[PDB]
Structure formats: structure tokens, C-alpha cells
Design an enzyme around this catalytic site. Sequence first.
Site, mmCIF file in Angstrom:
data_model
loop_
_atom_site.group_PDB
_atom_site.id
_atom_site.type_symbol
_atom_site.label_atom_id
_atom_site.label_comp_id
_atom_site.label_asym_id
_atom_site.label_seq_id
_atom_site.Cartn_x
_atom_site.Cartn_y
_atom_site.Cartn_z
ATOM 1 N N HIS A 88 5.193 36.683 60.953
ATOM 2 C CA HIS A 88 5.121 37.719 59.932
ATOM 3 C C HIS A 88 4.892 37.152 58.535
ATOM 4 O O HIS A 88 4.397 37.879 57.668
ATOM 5 C CB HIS A 88 6.394 38.562 59.957
ATOM 6 C CG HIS A 88 7.635 37.777 59.682
ATOM 7 N ND1 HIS A 88 8.187 36.916 60.606
ATOM 8 C CD2 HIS A 88 8.424 37.709 58.583
ATOM 9 C CE1 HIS A 88 9.267 36.355 60.090
ATOM 10 N NE2 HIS A 88 9.432 36.818 58.863
ATOM 11 N N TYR A 110 25.789 15.204 35.700
ATOM 12 C CA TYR A 110 25.752 14.976 37.144
ATOM 13 C C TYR A 110 27.118 15.199 37.784
ATOM 14 O O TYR A 110 27.206 15.691 38.915
ATOM 15 C CB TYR A 110 25.262 13.562 37.450
ATOM 16 C CG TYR A 110 24.813 13.383 38.887
ATOM 17 C CD1 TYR A 110 23.531 13.742 39.278
ATOM 18 C CD2 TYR A 110 25.680 12.887 39.856
ATOM 19 C CE1 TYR A 110 23.113 13.591 40.584
ATOM 20 C CE2 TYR A 110 25.268 12.735 41.179
ATOM 21 C CZ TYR A 110 23.979 13.090 41.531
ATOM 22 O OH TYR A 110 23.538 12.956 42.827
ATOM 23 N N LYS A 169 21.287 37.741 44.751
ATOM 24 C CA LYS A 169 21.426 39.180 44.988
ATOM 25 C C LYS A 169 22.336 39.769 43.955
ATOM 26 O O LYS A 169 21.924 39.955 42.816
ATOM 27 C CB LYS A 169 21.941 39.436 46.384
ATOM 28 C CG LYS A 169 20.800 39.631 47.395
ATOM 29 C CD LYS A 169 20.111 38.285 47.681
ATOM 30 C CE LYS A 169 19.355 38.297 49.033
ATOM 31 N NZ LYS A 169 20.242 37.640 50.004
ATOM 32 N N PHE A 215 22.396 38.106 59.043
ATOM 33 C CA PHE A 215 21.131 38.051 58.331
ATOM 34 C C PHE A 215 20.222 37.016 58.998
ATOM 35 O O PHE A 215 20.684 36.134 59.719
ATOM 36 C CB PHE A 215 21.373 37.707 56.861
ATOM 37 C CG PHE A 215 20.137 37.740 56.018
ATOM 38 C CD1 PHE A 215 19.559 38.947 55.669
ATOM 39 C CD2 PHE A 215 19.549 36.562 55.581
ATOM 40 C CE1 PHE A 215 18.420 38.982 54.890
ATOM 41 C CE2 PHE A 215 18.410 36.589 54.805
ATOM 42 C CZ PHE A 215 17.844 37.800 54.457
ATOM 43 N N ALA A 218 26.401 38.157 49.892
ATOM 44 C CA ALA A 218 25.230 38.371 49.051
ATOM 45 C C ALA A 218 25.341 39.668 48.262
ATOM 46 O O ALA A 218 25.107 39.687 47.048
ATOM 47 C CB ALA A 218 23.964 38.371 49.903
#
EC number: 4.1.99.1
Lengths: 466, 466, 466, 466
Positions: C457, C71, C265, C131, C224
Site C-alpha cells: 500500500h 549530549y 499525536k 497499532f 499516542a
Amino acid sequence: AKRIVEPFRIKMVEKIRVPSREEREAALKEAGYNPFLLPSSAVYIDLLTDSGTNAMSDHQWAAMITGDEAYAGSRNYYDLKDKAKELFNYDYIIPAHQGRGAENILFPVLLKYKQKEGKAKNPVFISNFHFDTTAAHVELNGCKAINIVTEKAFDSETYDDWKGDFDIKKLKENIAQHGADNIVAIVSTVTCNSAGGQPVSMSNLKEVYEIAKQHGIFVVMDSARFCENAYFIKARDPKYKNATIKEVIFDMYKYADALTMSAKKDPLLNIGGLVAIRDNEEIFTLARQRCVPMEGFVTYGGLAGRDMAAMVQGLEEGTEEEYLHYRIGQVKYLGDRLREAGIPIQYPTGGHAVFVDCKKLVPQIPGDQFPAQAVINALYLESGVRAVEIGSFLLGRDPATGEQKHADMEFMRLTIARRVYTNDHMDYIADALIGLKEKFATLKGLEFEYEPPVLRHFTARLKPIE
Amino acid sequence: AKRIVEPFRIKMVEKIRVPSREEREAALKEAGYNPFLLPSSAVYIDLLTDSGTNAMSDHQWAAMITGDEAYAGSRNYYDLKDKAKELFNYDYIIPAHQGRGAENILFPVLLKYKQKEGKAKNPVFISNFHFDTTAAHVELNGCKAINIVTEKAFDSETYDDWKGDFDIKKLKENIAQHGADNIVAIVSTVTCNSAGGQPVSMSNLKEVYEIAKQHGIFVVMDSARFCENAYFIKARDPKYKNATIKEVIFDMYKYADALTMSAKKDPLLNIGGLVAIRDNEEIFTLARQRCVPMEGFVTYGGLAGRDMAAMVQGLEEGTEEEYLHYRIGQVKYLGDRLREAGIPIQYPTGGHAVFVDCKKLVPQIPGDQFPAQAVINALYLESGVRAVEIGSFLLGRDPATGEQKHADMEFMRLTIARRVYTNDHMDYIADALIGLKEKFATLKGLEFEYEPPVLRHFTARLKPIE
Amino acid sequence: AKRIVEPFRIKMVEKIRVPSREEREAALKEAGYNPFLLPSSAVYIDLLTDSGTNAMSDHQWAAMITGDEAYAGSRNYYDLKDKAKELFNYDYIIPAHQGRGAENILFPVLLKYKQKEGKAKNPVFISNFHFDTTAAHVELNGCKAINIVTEKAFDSETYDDWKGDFDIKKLKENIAQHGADNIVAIVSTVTCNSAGGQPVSMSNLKEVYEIAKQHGIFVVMDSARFCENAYFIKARDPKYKNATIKEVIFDMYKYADALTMSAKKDPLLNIGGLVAIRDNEEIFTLARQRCVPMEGFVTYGGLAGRDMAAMVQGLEEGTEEEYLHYRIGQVKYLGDRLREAGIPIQYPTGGHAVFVDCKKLVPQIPGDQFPAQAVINALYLESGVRAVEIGSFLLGRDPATGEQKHADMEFMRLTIARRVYTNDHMDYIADALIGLKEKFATLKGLEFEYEPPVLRHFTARLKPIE
Amino acid sequence: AKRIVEPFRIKMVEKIRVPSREEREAALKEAGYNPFLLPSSAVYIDLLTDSGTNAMSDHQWAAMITGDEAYAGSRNYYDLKDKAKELFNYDYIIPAHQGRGAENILFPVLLKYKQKEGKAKNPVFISNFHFDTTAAHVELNGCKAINIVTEKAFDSETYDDWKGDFDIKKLKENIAQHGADNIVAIVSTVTCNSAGGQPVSMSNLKEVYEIAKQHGIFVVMDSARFCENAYFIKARDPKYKNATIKEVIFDMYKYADALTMSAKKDPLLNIGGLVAIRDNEEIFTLARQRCVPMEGFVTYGGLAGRDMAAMVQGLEEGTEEEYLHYRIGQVKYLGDRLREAGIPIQYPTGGHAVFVDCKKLVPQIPGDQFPAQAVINALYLESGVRAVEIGSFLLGRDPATGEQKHADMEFMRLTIARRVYTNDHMDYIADALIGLKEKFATLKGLEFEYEPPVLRHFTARLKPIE
Ligand SMILES: [K+]
Ligand SMILES: [K+]
Ligand SMILES: [K+]
Ligand SMILES: [K+]
């Protein structure tokens, strides 16, 4: 009895369950009252063996994931060769799929090598004690397997430091009786499995090697449990009181010419074996020639690359004193639990197993009725624990006469895998056996329902005598 | 040349790199101009074998993770037994650590079984073609290994549907010449490795089995590449044009009494083997007795439980027609690339490898100078691709005279692992060999720098004929 | 079109199948003609994202196996910190569960920090292009998201080296119009995802950073796809012609003060994110305070230890020039296949995806009837390939009027996962789209069957207009 | 004290080591006498938390290996959805990267939904006790977090069956004082973490839900430790004495409208979270809209597919009574070791941790000098065990005055991970603390060397007052 805490924590578990008494009764009946025929799903705790059932570390699995599976020149082959040079100071290696594969590679080659100049006419192998498969390969190649363990090993409950020692007197006797030209090899087994995993002393290994060199005899170290032997040397020999385990190992292998190893034992693997040769390049070349048709190409020897990778890491982990202290201590803890309850065992406990004298537990059962097997089956029915018989059932019949061979002892072997069970599992085993004490006098022997001619203990079906 | 798209996508990659021209040159010199002595780190694409280098699926890895490592009665043993019953309709199995381990279990048992009635005094094995390890175990047990492949296989560039077929005329002749009493077993190799991975037709397997039954001869199916054989049967036999692969497989094994299998091939594994027996319980019992000292206890046979688990899954995946179409299509694609560029190959391509006739590439190098090995070394120096020689270097010397046996063909084998390389890797191999055309005429032969007595092509060191 | 060979081979595969025409029709109908509603079992090749679908290496998997799950103070946390110092020369890290988790950590902290002096009352963020999730977090904190990509990105088919560049004129214009006091941060997106994965030049990054420092504005590098951007800089800027990828990376991050990164990515992971800060210890402390309630404790940040371990290894593998050349080369190959067939795309192709101009393929379909989505659905029915729409369907309705917003371009995005698909999979995609050329004139648009108010979408159900 | 045997065996181990006292002295000093700043490499046994440090099964790992990493429509998403329907009978799920991610998804949506109806003008949340991150998200959205645990939880050593119960009287009082329109939600925490892992009774959950339905208040079950709560209900409620754990679980979720769950606790994972909603589709749609920018797309929610796969398997394993009996029994055994030595603890022990009242062990150390932290540091220096402080150090300063708030109890929390440590590790922890009895009276307090403004207990550096 003293519990030793794990020098590790659990990363992954595997579920085991106690089947109901009705299931165990049905399963044992289906297995013909022979636990070797039980499916693993019928078993809670498995004490059949310490071979290939160990728990690997996350570092071993990580090594497997990046293992090199190339047919020739695997990166892990060179790592394994370097590791053998680091641990044993030996210059040549041949991987094998497991220990008896290593013996099949090396032992016929030693026979051919001894015979090449016209010797080995009545060839023998001499050991403190040959393991079963070791002696099998000795005899399959037309040789006699001679065992000369120290007499201290036959007094089961009397303590001694080195119950796996060679009897030096008997070694010199056999050399004179058979001649150095007929001794294909001396096999030093460490620990001495057939004496119960009992250690061989450094001075005994040294004297055996000196005797072998003056007579020009090759020495093979059967190294399945070489790390447990090394721990015992550090624990009981004052010379090595302040040595590292690796330093003890390095000294041990000054007193051999080669080693055969089951990596399924102390190297903490599920599969794998190893031949290593100190410096005899001719034997190395001959063993390579036999390896190819028998095991595989010489840079993997019937092993996946990932298994050579795990062996490199496990060889390191198997030498860690803290783990060895815990591992061997857990076996001692189980033994001390039984001894404090009056259960007779071989004492001191060896490195990997506790041996329970069943002849004293069920005296009403003669040897030809397999008393240890009766206790083992009773243990399974009471608890789901599966153990293995080292006694009359295992010893078998004399091939010439067909008579039950005489067993000196009727042992139940409780073989403990490495890093698999907790001391609570050990308590579960002990409390299960201890709870049978009032029922031992009521146990009946066993007779054959089906008996094969050879290797009966694996597949024979038994039935209770009523 | 037609590329077939993968019926899968990539889940895990392994890095391979092309060492610089000087690194490849230095490595090849260090390996004594024998690529078998190269470490895998000096190799970009490895074409030495299709054995044990395959890429498993995520379902195979998951099966390993939950594998049952129990010494006796592993859950994966019972799964493997069910699978052999499903695919082959055989009732008995004995796992083995790999294919030659399976042969060491079964072949000595078949001999002792044949000899027990007082016959087989001059025993032989008959095969369409024995693989190297198969013939080795036959000859190690004092038997002659007879190969009788169809003559269509010796016309390398001429198409035939079934270049792995038995020669029926030669089979009947050898039965008459040696007697059915001296023929320990007939070995049907599917596909026929030594003919180049060329298939055997169903009717040929049927006629061989019928002839063997009329003479009471035991039939063993060498099943290393049985799934590639079944695909070929579906692709070229109109009777099976609408059958599933498993249906072809099921019919194939009506024409054998047992099988030996290297699971390192079509079952898509890195290690593992299998003996299966149709219904002869006596041979099954005898093979189990030999399995114990040679491989391990009979419910794991020298395999980790995780490897039996992967074998159950891989046996399923190896039969999938979409995968088989892609796999064999990738081998055909490499062959068509070379053939369309004027490189002479064995045609049609087999299931697992392309064989390139190197004498037609380097006619200035006579056979005793190892023309195929010279082409292989040049291919390595240009590209980092490692291939294997199937020619005069491999064929070796006559043991009685010590003279170079001359090979009829000087092949370079490009052996393709399963699900490992893309068709872009195939183009890279093809383009490298095609780009060698202007340098082929300048190639020099090879002579020995060091030649060992055995394992010659594996470890001999060569030098260029300056 | 040139195929580039993999600088790796396959170690593990995952099965994918092409469902039948009828299955694809049923699945698309069941999904309401929205591929975002398809289950993955209905998809052959998935081109929805390049996010989190990458194939890891065996070294990445090995790293997970030994990952430290502690942890606080995980070994992998310190490894990740050292790696950020090595690659970016930044002194502080905070792991995040993925990229938008990192944005949620940092962006509210940058706003509060800018507001601390009583300014930034009309706060904005400026980027070459935000983005979607980046712009979402900007607006969730009450700020305006300003995009100022160079005009070169709007001429899709005309080549340019740096179509991801800031419009420097628009940067200076927006700074003057809003004032440096309202500019919370400048976000440099590399590569510029919304411009089509197009790279940002080193000189553009340098000029933006110098302009920002003279006005006291904080610069965040949205990282990314920072490795694909670095490859382009080496490929197209002669100043870095002989620099390593890591050297290009090191210069890139001289021109930012902090970074947010989706490791899903370029770091080649399935999950994971990262905030790194150059030296502003105050912003680092505030970001740690927000990390605890939003993501987790600061030494794991909503990641498993194994995932931090995989990120350390993946950060290394993502910078390897040979891999970057192959990866970006596969995207270019897919683009060149389509372009050579007359399919209009954005040119040159970016680092991770090909964008197909659907308005030119189906001009008979008006924008409010979603022409790019009609091509996507047709592509799926023909091949099982799933792509994503970047057009009127994604752009949504005007919040003020409720009328369909006008899209400048109607793109179909073919997003390529890393090390997952082969160039044969690329041919399969291209040949399917090319085979639709005679059907493009016959395609009908789509209208809504169910439309949600926001993020339509993802879940809206469509029906063909006929 | 009773040890309970593991209903599993170890499949993989992870190395942990005890650094020498000199290393611990150096490590603790380097960490500023705050164990939260220690590296895990300085820790032998870690008792900091029970979150995400659990040991998975081989089936959980196998599930990860075949995990579906698809961006949309992962097979594991639908499996997880089916599992939530099976266990809880809830029709909607939203995965989250961990428990506080789930709270960030749901709690702002419940507030907005309540405000959309004109309510929640002075919004509050009511719980038996809010967990730390739970209350943090309540306060981040401008709401008051009200805790009304039963008074039985404040009597530390007096046994009670249900110390996690809601105080019904205080519940009805808060409803009257604040009005039902201002109660955004009732959070039923099971087990009640802040009471020490103490269970909530079925009838208490039932009465709370019935009260909430009469007032139209939404009920969320904070379900991090719902399986430990279910075991306690079966163990202590005669109504469910003969019900299975799943039947107990199924009844529990009749008394909530939704759940937030950290799968890092009882589902036996290292990462992962879950929102499930019973039947309110509107709340589900709003939580999906917030999930997208905050966590990820709705079919993975900031989790890798492999982690959803493990969660499906872990939800099943976490409900197994044999495992729960062992798990909670191991925690009880550690408590019983301490009680038998006279060490005061909260009694009965909760499901996941033992709490030691340190004020009674070191009464000479006042609350403002952190007596529990002094015991923790000594415990670490004596043994390498790392524990966490629940007392004045954690409670912090009063924001209005800036002086140390007075803590009612000075607890040391010993939090036990699942399937990680053996009962021998428990003995090692107990024996270390018991061996400190003579050093307790000599212990000195601690003062600040460096104190941050917020969340000091994570990063503050202390020094011994001496
Ligand atoms: K095993
Ligand atoms: K292999
Ligand atoms: K993913
Ligand atoms: K964790």
C-alpha cells in the site's frame, strides 16, 4: 594584551567572507572611496558602529517568538514598565523605535514644559557631550547644544579614570551666563560617547544633579551605554568595589529625572529605544502626546511587541558583569594590541570602541585632505575591514563661511558590536592595521568628487589626490 | 453570507482565552470603561486595529532569520529597493519604522520644497481623506489638511463601487480657491481609510493625477492598503477583469509621484514603513537628510534588517489574489452576517473593517453620551471582543471653544487583522452582537470620570450614566 | 452540525494551493494512482495522518529556541522527567525519536524479561487493538499479536460510548488459552486507533489492569492519543463529569505499569516519542541498555534537545480542555457534515479522524478491486484532498495462499492534524465528497500495475480497471 | 601554535557559566565522580562529544522554518535526495533519525541479502575500525566485527599522514581466513573515529574497494566525518592539492557502494542521519522495508521535515574549505598548546578531538584505578570543563574472567563541537590542564562505589581512593 574568554558559547553563526583585493578595489571605487557607500557584501568585518549589530541570546529570540503584538496593552509593555522600575526606579515609560526617536519624543516636550510659564527665551541644553542626533534634535527645536566635557578628555594618550566627566566649573559658569530659566535640560551622557565612550563618575553625576536641583533644572540621562558606564564605576571607584552592576545602575539613576536610551547599544538589540521618566507625571503625559503621531501608540511606540520582549531580556543580560568584563575587555585587548605596536590610540580605551590617532600615522596629509579617511580606505583595501572617520571629514564645513571646520583630532573609530566578533577577529584587525606601518608615509589625501551641502560624510564621493 | 476558505493552513498558533464574566467586568471597570485601557490579557478577540497584528508566513519568518543587520548597505535594503522598482516602478526608497514615520520624513520636505521658490505662504494638503497621523503631520507643519471624498461615502448604507473617490469638483474648486502655489501636495489614500476602507477607482486616480500635473502639484500615494484597493479595482472595474493584481498595482502608481506606506497593513508585517519616490531626485535627497535624525541612517530607516527582509516577502504575499479574495471575503462575511440579522453597517464593506451604525442600535443614548462606546463596552462584556469607537468620543472637542464636536455618525469599528482570525471567530463576533438585541434598549450612555486634554479617546476614563 | 471556535488565533501561516484539474490528473497518474506516492506539492489539504503534521504554539517554538542540546544531562531531559511524574505519576522516562522507536526499545525488553524464567516459549501480546507499528514490533520479536476489541466497534453506524473497549470475555479467554506465562504484555491503546480513534472507558482500563495483576502480566499503555481518550472519559462518564483532564489522565495511568507514546499525536509535535515506566527499575535498566544502540544516549534518546523541550510544553498544551473540545469538535463537525448528507461513517466519530464506509458508496466495486481507494482517488481529483485507505488494499494478500485477504470493512480515513485546518477546510472536504454522490455509481475499481511483496500500500502502482 | 580566524561571525549566543569550585565539588560528588552523570548546568565547556552539539547557521535555521512536515513526499526529502546525488553521486537515500538508526536500517539488510544467496554462514564485518554503535549492531545481528587499522595508528606520538588507513595485508589475510562469502560488508570509516579522528587516504580507499570488488564484497562508507577526511586528503595528498573539497568528496564515494552517515557530526546538525545507496536497487528496497517499522515512513525516516531541510543546507556548509580549515585548525591549536607545555597527545591531531595520554601525567595511578578519569575529574574541578575517558574505565571487564581488561592507552578525549567554542575557550581548556602540572603527582585513583553490569562508564559511581 590580555584576551578574556567568552562567558557564553556560539549558538548560531552568520557567514562573512574576505572579498579579493580586486573586488575590494572595484567596490571602493564604486563607493566613491567612501566606505559608508559600500554594500555590506563587500565587507568582511564591520566596525562602522556598535548600534543594532549585536548578537542576541537564545533567550532573547525565545522572548521575541512569544512576543505580544497587540496594538494596546501588550503583555511586553507591562514587562518593560516593570523592568524599568526594577533597574532605574522610574515610574513611567514610553517605548521608542530607537534612541533618536526617544529624543524626538522627550526633548521638544521639555522645551514646551520649560516655556509654559514664560521661560526658555534663549534656550540651551548642557551636556558633558551631546551625541550627534541628540545635538541635532536640540538644534532642530531652536536650542543651543552646549558641551562641557572635562579637560582630561582632550589629552588623548594620558590616562584618567573619568574622561567623560562634566566640567563642574563650566557647568556653574553656563548657569550664571545663560540663567537657570534658559537651561531647558542637562543631559548626562553615560558613557560619554563623543569623548570616546569614556565613563562618568558617580560623584560627578551626583554633583551635576545637586547643582541642577538647586536651580530647578531637569536632568536627562542619555543611557545608550549605561551598563558600560556602570562597569567602569565598579572597576575604578573604590566605593563600589563590592557592589553589583545593578546596584551601581540603581545609584546612577538617583541623579537624573528621566532617561533616553538607544536599546540598540547596551541592551543588546538590533532595534529599539526607550524613554523613562522618574516621577514627573506632567512631562510623561506631554511626551505621550508627542509619541502618538511621531512614533506610534504609547504601549508600543514604533516597536513590534517582539522587540519590546527582546528589550526586557536584553536589559537584564546587558547588566551581567561577566559579559561586561569580557565585552569591555575585548575592546581593551584590541587597543592594547595597537598600543604595543606603537599605534597611537585614545587611552584608556572606552567601553565600545578604539580610537586611532591618524594624524600621527599620515602626517604628510593635511586635515582638509582627510588623513583618517585615507587610513580607513587603506585599511579596507588591505583587509576588508570597514571603520569610520571621526575627524575633518565628519566635522564638515562651517555653515556661515563654507570653510573646513578645524578638527583637534583625526580619529579612525573601530566600533565593536557586542558578542559578534572573537579576539581572533580583533587580531585580524590589529594585524591588518599594523601591517600598514611601512605604507602610511606613502598614502595620499582625498578630495571631493561629489559633496552634498549637509551630512557630507554619509554620501560624499571622494577621490585620491595624485 | 458566504465563507471563503483559507488559501493557507496554520503553522503556528497563539493561545487566546475568554475571561469569565466577572473577570471581564472587573477588567472593564479597571480600564475606566475605556477598552483602549484594557491589557491584552483581558481580551479574547482584538478588533482595535488591523495594524501590526497580522500573521506572517513561514517564508517571512525565514527571511527575518537571515536578515542583514548591517548599519549601511544591508542586503535587505537593496532587495527592498528592487521590490519597489518591480511593484511600483519607482526608483528611490527610504525605509521608515512605520507609516507615520514615513510621513514625518516626506511631508516636511515637500513643504520646504514648495516654499523655496517664495510661494506656499498659506500652504495646504489635499486628500480624498487624510488618515489621523497624516493630517496630524500636515497640521504640525503649519498646513491645512483638506478632505474632499466623494459624497457617495456619506450615504452609509447605500451601495457604491468607489466610495473612496476624490470629489473632482471640489478638487478643482480648492485649487482655484487656494491656488496651485499653496497646494504642497495631493495625497491619494488607497484604500480610503477614513471613508471605511473604501476603494478609489483607477479613473479617479488618473483624473486626480492629470489635474495635479496641469497645475504642477506633487502627488503622494498613501499606500497602507494599496493591495486591497487593487483587488477592488479588479473586482469592480470591467477594464481590469482579466488583469493580475500586480498589473493593477502597476497602473495605480502611474498616477502618483511618490508613496508613503505603513507596511503594518497590506504588506502583512508587525512593524515597518516605506517612502518611495518615482523619479524626483531632489526631494529624495532632501528626505534622506531628514530621515537621519528622525528615523536612522538611510539604508535601514529605523528598521532592523530582519524587518526589511520580512517586508520584501510580505509585499509579494500581499498582492496574491487568492489571499486578497479570502481576506476581503472574510470582512464581507462578517458584514453580511450582521446585515442579514438586521444590524445596520456601512455597505459595501471595505477591505479591512466593518463599521456598525450604533445610534440605530441604541437610540435612547444621545450622541453626547457616546452610543457607539456603550455598544462596544457591552460587546466586550458579553464576549471578550474588543472593538474601537469611531464617533463622538473619538471626534473630540473644538480646541478654541472646548466644546464637544458632534459626529454625524456613531460607528463601532470591527477592524480585522490579516490571516489571524477564522470565520468561526467572525461568527463568534456576529453572534455576540446579534445576541445583544434584547439588551440594546436597556443600555445606558457614558460620561467622563477623567478627561485628559489630549489623547482623549485613548486614555479618558468613563463611567456609566446611572 | 456545530462548528466550534478556535481557543487560539493564528500566529504563522503556511501556503497551500489547489493544483489544477490537469495537474492533479497528471500527478495521480505519475503516482501510479497511489496517493502515498504523491509529492506534497500536489496536495492541497493532507488528510493522510494526524502524525507529526500538527501546528505548534509560539510557546513550543520558544521552548525549542532555548533547548539544551547537551549530549548528557540536558536541562530538557530533566524537565521531561518531571513532567512525566506530574502527569502520569511514573518515576522513569526514556525519550525516543518517535512512537515506534519507543516500541523498539521496550517490547524486546519485555519479552526477554518474561523469558528470564524459561517461560514465554509461545509468547503473545494482547491488546484491544495493536497499532500497525506496534503489531509489527510484536511479530518482529517472534510473538503473536492478539486484538480483542469489543464487538460494539464492528457495528459502525450504531452509537456507543466506548467502542475502544477491550472485550473482557476475550481477554479472559485468551489468558486461559495461552496461559499467563505466554502473555508477554497487555497493550491498552488509548484511544483505540484501529477501532477508529474510539475511547476506552476508565472502568474497562481498570478491569483489564486488575485481571492482568492477578495473573502477573505487565500492562503497557499505548498513549499516542491519551488526551483525546481522557476528553471522552470526562465527556461520557458521569463519574468524571467535574474532574479536570489532568485528573482523568492521572486515573488512567493507575491502570498500567509503563507507557509507550508517539508525541507526534496528542503532545502536538512534529517528531518525538517517549517511554515511561511506573516503578519497575529492572525493566527501566534493560530498556536503557537497548536504547543506546537503537536510539541514542539515554538523556536524549534520538531527539534533539529542542524536541524534548517542545515535548514538555506540548504535553501541557495537549491536556487543555478548551483545545480538546475544539479539536474533537472539528472532527465531529466533519463527520456530521457527511452524515447529514447521507454519507455513511463510523459513528460516533473518534478523536482524530472520520472513517467513511466506501462499500456502501461504491457497492459495484468488489473488495479485491479496492473500493475505498477508488473513492480516495476520485476525492483527490475533485479537490486536491489526500486521504488514506483502510481496507482491502491495506490488508494485503494472505501469506499462506497469496490470495487477497477479505476485509470486513472498506474505510476511507480522513485523518485530521491538530490546529492546522479550519472548519472551512472541513467544509471544503465534505462538500467535495458530497459533490461526488452522483459520480459514485460510475466509479470503476483498480488493479495492480506494479505490486511489491510486502507493504504494498505504500508503493504499489495501480491502474483503473476499464 | 597558530590561531585561525573564524570565517563567520556570531549571530546568536547561548549562556554558559563556570560554577564555583564549591559548586563543582558538590556537583561532582553528587554525580559520583563520573562526569557522565553531571547535569549540563554544572558544565561550563562540554567536551564530552562532537555529536549533535554543533552551532547551525542562520540559513540552516531559515531552512527549518520553511520545512515541509508532510508525512509523505516532503519537499525536503526530494532536496535531500538531490543533494546526495550531487555530493556522492548515489541514486537512493533513506533518511534516519541519526547515525545508529542508519546502521540499524542497513546492516541487518546486508546480512539477510548475503544469507539469501547461501553465503554469510559465519558472517563477519571488516573495518579499519568500527565505531562503538557500528560494532554493536554487527554483534547484535550475530556477526563478528573485525578491526584492521594500520599499525601507524598505534604509535601515538609518531607523525603519519593517514593513521586511519586500512591495513591492506590484514584485509587480504582476513578474506582468505574467513572466505569472501562470509564477509557481509567492509566498512570504510572516514575519518577513522577510533584511531582518533585520523584520515584515510584516497589510495587506501581505492585499494580496499578494488579488493572488495574482486571478491564481491559490499563496501559501506561510514561517513559521519567525511568532510574532515576530505580536507585532510586535500591537505596531505599532492594529487588533490588543487581540487575542491566537493571534488575530493566525489572521488571518495567512487570507492563505496553505500554510506551510513550521522549528520550530527560534519553536516553540522543537532540530530539526523542518512543512508545513501549508489545503485543497488534491491538493497534499497530491503532497507526501505526495514526503515518503516524501525524509523518511520521512507520520506522522513524518523526526522522532522525541518531537520531534513537543515541537513540539505548543512551538507553544503560542511564541505566549505574555509570552514574546514578553521575547524580542523582550532583542534590543532588546542593540541599545539598542550604539546608546547609538554603534555603528551596523539599526533597529529585528528579532525574533531584531541587525545591526551594520561598515564604519562599521573604514572602513580595504575590502570585499574582509571588514571585518565582522575585527570578528567581534576580538570572539571579546576575549570568546569567536562571531558570523556578513553581508557580502562571505558574498556570494561573481561566477560569470561570478570577482571579489568588491560588498556594499551589511558586517553582523555577532548572532543570539539563545530562552530561552538572560540580559540579563547581552547586556551581556557589548555591553561586549566597546564595549571594542573603541580597537582598531577598528588592525584589519587578512583574505585567503584556502584558498578552496573553493562555500559558501566555511563552510570557507574566512583570515589577517590584516599
Ligand atoms: K540593525
Ligand atoms: K505590532
Ligand atoms: K513531521
Ligand atoms: K543534540
